[PDB]
Amino acid sequence: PTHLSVDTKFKTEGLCVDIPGIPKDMTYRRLISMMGFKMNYQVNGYPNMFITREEAIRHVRAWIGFDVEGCHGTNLPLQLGFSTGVNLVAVPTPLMYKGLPWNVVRIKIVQMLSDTLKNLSDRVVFVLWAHGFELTSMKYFVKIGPERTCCLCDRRATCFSTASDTYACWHHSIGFDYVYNPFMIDVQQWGFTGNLQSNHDLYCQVHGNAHVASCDAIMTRCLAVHECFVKRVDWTIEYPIIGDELKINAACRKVQHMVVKAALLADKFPVLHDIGNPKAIKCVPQADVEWKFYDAQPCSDKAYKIEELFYSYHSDKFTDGVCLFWNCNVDRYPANSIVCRFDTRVLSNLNLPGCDGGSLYVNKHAFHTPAFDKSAFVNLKQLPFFYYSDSPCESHGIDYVPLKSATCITRCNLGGAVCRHHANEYRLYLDAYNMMISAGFSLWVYKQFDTYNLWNTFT
Ligand SMILES: CN(CCO)c1ncc(Cl)cc1F
Ligand SMILES: [Zn+2]
Ligand SMILES: [Zn+2]
Ligand SMILES: [Zn+2]
């Protein structure tokens, strides 16, 4: 019990309007066969085209919604919709494309999945609300066989060329014409009542339905993400490194020690209220303050209501000292807050589109994050960039151009000439900070926060 058995049952009711007469008793084995594929009793690391929920969840970065609509079945033109927003029209002979045969349409499919997936995943998982035309259309652009490696690298193959009779991964697939060894999962096998739109719209206002293929494909992946990452949350599942995950996580630790350390030095709060992750530690262990912790798991669905977090009767006085919300998403921060809030709208490889304007940020773990709302920060201001150190000016061990910055808050710069050590640290910390910002995290602070207050911490 790791892979989906081909002898598992498949509920065919969803199928029976595109495919009138379909047996009620049906396995994956008979379905895969019906879709026109011979598995060839093969023990070569691809037991089933179809996969478990848990396998799909481990492979979320691979998810592409797929939907087909009878545009007028061998007879008639098909509309191919993907959760990239692409619509291709195949003939037998937002983006909407004109009617073209399978031999060109399949080239476009490889180009499309390869660009989308090459920096996310080693595979594709077509996410379905299966009614029949999507399953029967796959023979026109899919080939299955034993697991293979790229003809130019050691990445597993995801594409095949009939021109060259060779195999490529997503990176090396240019001019390839077939999707090789795809995975797929039918959402309609998870026990839903009524149609897609009805269930999607229970959870999501952001994706409308223009009655076109791409719209259903997006709605399908949305509902899938809702079920697997919003309503259900599995924080145990790890995920491969595919980008700057380790630099971003480190940057985030540095910035947090910096900002909170300086917040305490500037306004000398007697108590810090640390609201969020129950695993969180004192980011400034040295600081004078009463450090009080308050457990709140990352809300995946709707942002926490400050009313429900604080009131219902703690120092209880959360208006005493400062409230630290480090990736704790609430509706409206109090004015005495330091806030780190992930911006769901950022374009990166770590950040997958989500449900109801939210986003799925995958970095070691998967965290569905509520839609960024600018109105949450009305009592606060954007935190300005700055570097602060009280460490001795002293090189040790980093080639130089004399550092001039107003935002380098150090004994040296007060004395008008930044020492080389604090100039190395400064340009390191600025890089970290830039990393974190571009990665999508935003920083906000109580309005009275003024970096001018930090200079007098040397005298
Ligand atoms: C935001 N973030 C990284 C999420 O990818 C993070 N923030 C603070 C600490 Cl202490 C550690 C972290 F990893
Ligand atoms: Zn390759
Ligand atoms: Zn949606
Ligand atoms: Zn110095």
UniProtKB/Swiss-Prot annotation:
Residues 49-230 form the ExoN domain. Zn(2+) 14 binds at C150, C153, C169, H172. Signal peptide: none annotated. Inhibited by Remdesivir antiviral drug (GS-5734). Coiled coil: none annotated. Residues 239-459 form the N7-MTase domain. Mg(2+) 1 binds at D67, E134. Zn(2+) 15 binds at H200, C204, H207, C222. S-adenosyl-L-methionine binds at D274, I275, G276, N277, P278, K279, A280. Mg(2+) 2 binds at E69, H211, D216. Zn(2+) 16 binds at C393, C412, C419, H422. It is found in: Host cytoplasm; Host endoplasmic reticulum. It catalyses: a 5'-end (5'-triphosphoguanosine)-ribonucleoside in mRNA + S-adenosyl-L-methionine = a 5'-end (N(7)-methyl 5'-triphosphoguanosine)-ribonucleoside in mRNA + S-adenosyl-L-homocysteine. The active site is at D67, E69, E134, H211, D216. Residues 355-369 are annotated as: GpppA-binding. Interacts (via N-terminus) with DDX1. Interacts with nsp10. Plays a role in viral RNA synthesis through two distinct activities. The N7-guanine methyltransferase activity plays a role in the formation of the cap structure GpppA-RNA. The proofreading exoribonuclease reduces the sensitivity of the virus to RNA mutagens during replication. This activity acts on both ssRNA and dsRNA in a 3'-5' direction. This is Guanine-N7 methyltransferase nsp14. The lineage of its organism: Viruses, Riboviria, Orthornavirae, Pisuviricota, Pisoniviricetes.
